[PDB]
Amino acid sequence: LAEALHQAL
Ligand SMILES: [Co+2]
């Protein structure tokens, strides 16, 4: 989840 959020943003 952490990296999903980072990439999305
Ligand atoms: Co990151």
Whole-angstrom Cα distance, residue 1 to residue 8?
A: 10
The resolution in angstroms reads 0.8
CA of 4 relative to ligand 1 center, distance in Å: 8
Ligand 1 centre distance from Cα of residue 7 (Å): 7
Q: Which residue has the tokens 């999305």?
A: 8
6 alpha carbon – ligand 1 mean position (Å): 5
Task: Please give the structure tokens belonging to residue 4.
Answer: 């999903």
Question: Which residue type is seen at 2?
Answer: A
Residue 5 alpha carbon to ligand 1 centre in Å: 8
Say which residue the tokens 């959020």 belong to. Answer: 5
For residue 3, what is the enclosing H or E element?
Answer: helix 2-8
Alpha-carbon distance of 9 to 1, in angstroms, equals: 12
Q: What 3-state class would DSSP assign to 6?
A: helix
Radius of gyration of the chain (CA): 5
